[PDB]
Amino acid sequence: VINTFDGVADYLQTYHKLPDNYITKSEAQALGWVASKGNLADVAPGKSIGGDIFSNREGKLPGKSGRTWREADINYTSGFRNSDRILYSSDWLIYKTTDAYQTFTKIRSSSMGVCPKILKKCRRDSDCLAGCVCGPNGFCGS
Template sequence: MANHQKLKSILGILLGALLIFWATESGFLAESNSGQEDVLTQQHKHSASDKEDSDVVEGQAYSSPKQVAAYLHLYNQLPENYITKEEAKAAGWIPEEGNLWEVTDKKSIGGDHFGNYEESLPAEDDYKEADVNYKGGHRGAERLVYSDDGDIYYSPDHYDSFEKLYEGEQ
């Protein structure tokens, strides 16, 4: 009889833990947000121990959204293969010609101000932008947008939607 009670207790605890896990993962217990995060297509908060963080090394070149975001998160700067528009133009870049890789050592554009004019992101932050997945030629639509306090967003479609990759200090 005592074993039967122990088994019921253990099953009850396991069932409760499973229910809490399901409710948390499904968002059932999520608090409602001020409509600001409704603009975001998804939100992922990463910690410094995540795999993509451990895959980046200071001083190396990166272009994938996750690796560039991890680099920004860890080192608070863009990887070495990024230059601003002004630096690119000084090197001979003519945007209409898509000649960035021809006049630089395969650099990408990043570090310039992002206006957030549509207020798609929280208005209290100032932002910068960086091209990601750039493979030469004309700039594509993919961007990272990041704030000084550590928020990092990915836009696959030139600012039509955003996915929050990292949450900075509030």
């Protein structure tokens, strides 16, 4: 399980998706989760809610034309949800909250343009992770 602020931040910035222990609120509801029961880990062992749009109604995270925000639960194991969330933008800024969206702390600048240090074969750039291009020997790199 990757469910720490730094673990999920690094996974997001590398892979542009949440790790495999996350399910959206509607998926969780479908799978049996009822918020008022505190039953997420009973119906979905080892899972956490994550991946939904965060509307940023209060404007506490920075806005930009075309930028949207998503959220995921952090440090969840079982019972009712806690107050910790990671926030990630469509341009791959990373913030956190530990007080249920009252305040936020920036924890990563955008990773766009940075190629992760991961060995991967390719024939074209879209075979590579974000930030990476295909080189003349059929491996991805900066």
